[PDB]
Amino acid sequence: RLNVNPTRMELTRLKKQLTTATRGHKLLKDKQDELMRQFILLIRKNNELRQAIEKETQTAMKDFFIDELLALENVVVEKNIMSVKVPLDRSIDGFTQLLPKLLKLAEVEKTCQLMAEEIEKTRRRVNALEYMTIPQLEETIYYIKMKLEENERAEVTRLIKVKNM
Amino acid sequence: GGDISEPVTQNTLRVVKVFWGLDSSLAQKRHFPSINWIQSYSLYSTEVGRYMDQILQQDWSDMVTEGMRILQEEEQLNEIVRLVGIDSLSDNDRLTLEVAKSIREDYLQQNAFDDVDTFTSREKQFNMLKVILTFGKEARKALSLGAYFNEIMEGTVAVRERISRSKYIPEEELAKISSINEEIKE
Amino acid sequence: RRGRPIKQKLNPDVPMITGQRVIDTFFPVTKGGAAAVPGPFGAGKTVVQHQIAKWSDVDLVVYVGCGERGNEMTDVVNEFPELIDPNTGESLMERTVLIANTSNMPVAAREASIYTGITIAEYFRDMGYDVAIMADSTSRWAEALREMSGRLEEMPGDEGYPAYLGSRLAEYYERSGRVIALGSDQREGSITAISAVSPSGGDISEPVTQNTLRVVKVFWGLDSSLAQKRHFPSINWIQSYSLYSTEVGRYMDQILQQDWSDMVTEGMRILQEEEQLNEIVRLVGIDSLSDNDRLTLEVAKSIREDYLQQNAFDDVDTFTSREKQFNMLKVILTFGKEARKALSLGAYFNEIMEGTVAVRERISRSKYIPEEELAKISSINEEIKETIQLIVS
Amino acid sequence: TYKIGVVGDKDSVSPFRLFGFDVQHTKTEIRKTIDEMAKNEYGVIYITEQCANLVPETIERYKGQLTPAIILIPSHQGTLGIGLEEIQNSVEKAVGQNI
Amino acid sequence: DVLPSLSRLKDKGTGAGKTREDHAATMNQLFAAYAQGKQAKELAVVLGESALSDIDKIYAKFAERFENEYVNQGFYTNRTITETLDLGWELLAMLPRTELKRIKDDLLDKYLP
Amino acid sequence: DVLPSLSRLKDKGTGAGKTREDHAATMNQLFAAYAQGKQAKELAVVLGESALSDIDKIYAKFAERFENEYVNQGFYTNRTITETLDLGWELLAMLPRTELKRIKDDLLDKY
Amino acid sequence: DVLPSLSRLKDKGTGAGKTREDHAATMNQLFAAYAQGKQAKELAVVLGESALSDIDKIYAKFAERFENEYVNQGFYTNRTITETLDLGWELLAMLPRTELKRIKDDLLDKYLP
Numbered sequence A: 001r002l003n004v005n006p007t008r009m010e011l012t013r014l015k016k017q018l019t020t021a022t023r024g025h026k027l028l029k030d031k032q033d034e035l036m037r038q039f040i041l042l043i044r045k046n047n048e049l050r051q052a053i054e055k056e057t058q059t060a061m062k063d064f065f066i067d068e069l070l071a072l073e074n075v076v077v078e079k080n081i082m083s084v085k086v087p088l089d090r091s092i093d094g095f096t097q098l099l100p101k102l103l104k105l106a107e108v109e110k111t112c113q114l115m116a117e118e119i120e121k122t123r124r125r126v127n128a129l130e131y132m133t134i135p136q137l138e139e140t141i142y143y144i145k146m147k148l149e150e151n152e153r154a155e156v157t158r159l160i161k162v163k164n165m
Numbered sequence B: 001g002g003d004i005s006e007p008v009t010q011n012t013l014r015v016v017k018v019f020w021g022l023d024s025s026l027a028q029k030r031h032f033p034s035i036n037w038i039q040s041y042s043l044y045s046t047e048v049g050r051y052m053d054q055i056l057q058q059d060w061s062d063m064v065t066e067g068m069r070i071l072q073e074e075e076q077l078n079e080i081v082r083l084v085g086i087d088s089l090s091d092n093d094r095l096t097l098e099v100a101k102s103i104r105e106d107y108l109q110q111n112a113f114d115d116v117d118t119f120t121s122r123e124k125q126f127n128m129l130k131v132i133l134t135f136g137k138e139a140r141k142a143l144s145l146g147a148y149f150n151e152i153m154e155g156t157v158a159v160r161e162r163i164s165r166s167k168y169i170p171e172e173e174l175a176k177i178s179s180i181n182e183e184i185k186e
Numbered sequence C: 001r002r003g004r005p006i007k008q009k010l011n012p013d014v015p016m017i018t019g020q021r022v023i024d025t026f027f028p029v030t031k032g033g034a035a036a037v038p039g040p041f042g043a044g045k046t047v048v049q050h051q052i053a054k055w056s057d058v059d060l061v062v063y064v065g066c067g068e069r070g071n072e073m074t075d076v077v078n079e080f081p082e083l084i085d086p087n088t089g090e091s092l093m094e095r096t097v098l099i100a101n102t103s104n105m106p107v108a109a110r111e112a113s114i115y116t117g118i119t120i121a122e123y124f125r126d127m128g129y130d131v132a133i134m135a136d137s138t139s140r141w142a143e144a145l146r147e148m149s150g151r152l153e154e155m156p157g158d159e160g161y162p163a164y165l166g167s168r169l170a171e172y173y174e175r176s177g178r179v180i181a182l183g184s185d186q187r188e189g190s191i192t193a194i195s196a197v198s199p200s201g202g203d204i205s206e207p208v209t210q211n212t213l214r215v216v217k218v219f220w221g222l223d224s225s226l227a228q229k230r231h232f233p234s235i236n237w238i239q240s241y242s243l244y245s246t247e248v249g250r251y252m253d254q255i256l257q258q259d260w261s262d263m264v265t266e267g268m269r270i271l272q273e274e275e276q277l278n279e280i281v282r283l284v285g286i287d288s289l290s291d292n293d294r295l296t297l298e299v300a301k302s303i304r305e306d307y308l309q310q311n312a313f314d315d316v317d318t319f320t321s322r323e324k325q326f327n328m329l330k331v332i333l334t335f336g337k338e339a340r341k342a343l344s345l346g347a348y349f350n351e352i353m354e355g356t357v358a359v360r361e362r363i364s365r366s367k368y369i370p371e372e373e374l375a376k377i378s379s380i381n382e383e384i385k386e387t388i389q390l391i392v393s
Numbered sequence D: 001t002y003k004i005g006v007v008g009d010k011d012s013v014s015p016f017r018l019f020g021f022d023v024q025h026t027k028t029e030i031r032k033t034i035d036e037m038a039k040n041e042y043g044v045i046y047i048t049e050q051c052a053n054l055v056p057e058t059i060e061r062y063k064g065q066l067t068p069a070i071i072l073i074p075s076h077q078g079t080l081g082i083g084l085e086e087i088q089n090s091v092e093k094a095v096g097q098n099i
Numbered sequence E, G: 001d002v003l004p005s006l007s008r009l010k011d012k013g014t015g016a017g018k019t020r021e022d023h024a025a026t027m028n029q030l031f032a033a034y035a036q037g038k039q040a041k042e043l044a045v046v047l048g049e050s051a052l053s054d055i056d057k058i059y060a061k062f063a064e065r066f067e068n069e070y071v072n073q074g075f076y077t078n079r080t081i082t083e084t085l086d087l088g089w090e091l092l093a094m095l096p097r098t099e100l101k102r103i104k105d106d107l108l109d110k111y112l113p
Numbered sequence F: 001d002v003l004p005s006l007s008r009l010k011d012k013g014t015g016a017g018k019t020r021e022d023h024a025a026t027m028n029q030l031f032a033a034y035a036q037g038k039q040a041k042e043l044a045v046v047l048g049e050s051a052l053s054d055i056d057k058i059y060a061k062f063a064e065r066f067e068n069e070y071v072n073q074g075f076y077t078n079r080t081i082t083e084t085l086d087l088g089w090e091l092l093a094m095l096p097r098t099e100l101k102r103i104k105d106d107l108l109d110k111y
């Protein structure tokens, strides 16, 4: 439990912090359940994309004086989805086709990684509240209320003894 | 044990009008004078605001209310943000955090031993407040110009330091403090 | 009520061989020292005392059944006449005087039973013997004083107990220690105090546990969660301590002629790193741990269920000689020593774990190796290097 | 505007240089060069599945930042689950069931 | 603070002939609108402003105005029962009708500006 | 634990002629940065190392060295006051000059 | 709940003539299988079902039958010591013989169905 001095004023303050903590734990897991929904549709799409482009890019690589000809044509936007920012000669012909195909593969695979990173930040946010913050308070409140009662219980006890004097 | 629920303090606060509650958590952090702003109060804060509004002919009672509101808003944020964390803090809310930090370390934090911080005159207490308050008010207009949070700070570290040593300005050199209002706008 | 006189007290620097590995290694009690065992109900306070009353290198044990169960006392006078020492042939009952005043027995007699035992423990101390005094339990003596205090209409102090509870406890533990007994012979006698504390709800903030911690230097804090997971003896390695570990470390290092204090400190460093790691595993995950840190948790796991765990009713583990403890801790430490050698060379985490499955079993059964076969343990050290070398290649 | 860097064997990634891409060709050498252009605000950093297994630490740390994206690409011989392993491990660890 | 404050006899005090017919309905409407607006402002602190919808942005704006314009009237400001109820409707006029569920449409179409 | 600890007679016992001219400014600068560094470490162990701000992360190491090297010195080490104050600046050189706000430019420049 | 429960004198109740010779061996293997099974059942809610291995889902499935068939008998269902041990042996057949590390090969070949 977090170190604290037992007082009636501290009891009510820790009582209000736990109620806000319990609701905040509810909301961050809702964000955890939500992220799991938009990640899952995007991830399955990426998995199918990645598999298709992978094999297709290799077969392009598979089909691929040659040094002198390659000597001498030189040719990401920030979008916020939810709480996460998201970025936006036959073998030669296959290369140019794949080059657009790889840019969309880059601005999609990197998007899923940013979803997984924010998923992990929220996940550990949620986990700490359930395993540390809220339990530390729950045990703290127990000790606080314990002390106050026996203290007033032992305080009125001596007052009965002083009354006999 | 810092327990103000004892009868001595409780009976005292039923007859006094001003309460300067000292906090241990701020004293250990070398914050001085370690007066708990949320916890402390003053029944004279209303009438002194009316007098101070007249002497310097400035709306002092409501710019003091704005400073107390900022410190009150931080305590609301800090308590909802201790456990949740500030990573999802909105850009607008983050400014208030940097406004409250400036109010706490620049104005409230003062050391008696240094000859300068020991005394603040009525003209100095206004100029420093005028810098920090107009900052949070005009930098609000900066963040409402489609600006990200990270930016306006990074480009104002030079102004934000002159704000730190605003207590240090001698009484004669007060123009130094009042000149921070135009550079923060620019 | 008045302790027997001596010439002068001596510093207890001779570590006692209790046979319990969690004790003699990390939290050692010296001959003449004072050790408190506070724990909740069914956490293993008495069982620890029964093992100490039977595997200690002492000339006489004094067991005080202060307010405990009546079945806990009948079990003594039946099992002890059968615990024959294989060297001298004398039973354990021949080497022990026990005093019994159970819970339902007169309440005031609990105080008399405590002072009766320590006086007998002092009578044999003056003969130059090393006597061990067992108090089971001191929390019931304290209730008798609180009960007596309520009858005398005295001003209660902390939680109803009389205000003189600090002195009565200090008056008792100071009657122990390694002494120079009276007479011209200048002989060395000692009294080792092993008292059990039974706090309400396992809360050590209660008065009698705090006053005991002030006057003793060994604290065997039992944990209820460990007693539930069948982790026995249920000694919390994070909260328990022994102020003799430094002096015992100097003495222990010398006889072994090995840096044993640096092996205990390193083994302790792994267990304290396990506590810091378990907070991250529950927060982030075990899969989020690095190969070196996940190795630390596995090496610390070997320290727990192979060295700290000791069954009281099993013959192979119930006792562990001093030479056997060194071979066991050296093998567990040699595991991580060569494992970090492999991780820094390029080996993976699971590559070392899956390739050492056969060797990892031999360490977990090392506790059941008899004292006449200690060469099996030390041979695993050389065996580990051979298994590690092929894994590297 | 950001630049695109490519890492891999000469035969497999050479034609990428005809479009204006930083085409480069051991673990510690890729680690220093990848972090070099990453500090020079590179947009996407394509790497082969053979050179990336030699520097998983560099990828693991670098993937967190949004501005530079490290993408695994096949070579002239192929891959062995590098895309799938990065994708499927991020699923089972962040969702709870393989899809 | 009106959330922990209660009046055990307010039902007879407010109504037709007493004050106005819309006294009981607007009370229960502004009461739930504040608790929802206060939790929405906290949702902007936990989940950020991006999680707040178009309706939540109005609820957070309601509580902020209800604190500063309704309750915050002044220790020297006498407001008649007529001026009090009409102010509540102006603060409730920010939310769409779909938000105002406690008030029946017979009286909602009578006073809502 | 130097955060809850305090001495009340020291202001008149430090300064130029007694110990060092700049003792008071370093001292004040130390505690404040240690308090925040300890505050950040208690956050690292809960919300993760990466979740901590980079500015705070420099502080997280500030408090780590300020406990194992500054405070941890052994029960038989008599370090001089000059060696103690020089050590303290070395622990303040980690943080950038802009974050040292309770040391004046005159004392910042000379040390 | 047998995890927090305990009987400190059960040793003087187990063994031949006081109970079936398998009593002590079956008791301790059932306990360890439940403790691991509940622990695995907890892992399925916190980290999903994909973070547990094939042997983990077996112990989790065993803990379901242990609580629903072995413990759940009914307040008017008197079992005997024979039927109790026979019901426990039937439950151990789910776990492989290599996982029953606390029962010697002897009692395994004699009672395991």
Ligand SMILES: Nc1ncnc2c1ncn2[C@@H]1O[C@H](COP(=O)(O)OP(=O)(O)O)[C@@H](O)[C@H]1O
Pocket: C039, C040, C041, C042, C043, C044, C045, C046, C047, C048, C227, C232, C233, C234, C310, C311, C312, C313, G008
């Ligand atoms: N070292 C041990 N080895 C094996 N079992 C133990 C050990 N210590 C305690 N136990 C188990 O815990 C139970 C209670 O132990 P005991 O010492 O009587 O508890 P208390 O703390 O109440 O004295 C015993 O019946 C025993 O089964």
Ligand code: ALF
Pocket: C040, C041, C042, C043, C045, C046, C198
């Ligand atoms: F069994 Al106990 F202390 F609970 F002796």
Ligand SMILES: [Mg+2]
Pocket: C045, C046, C047, C068
């Ligand atoms: Mg007992």
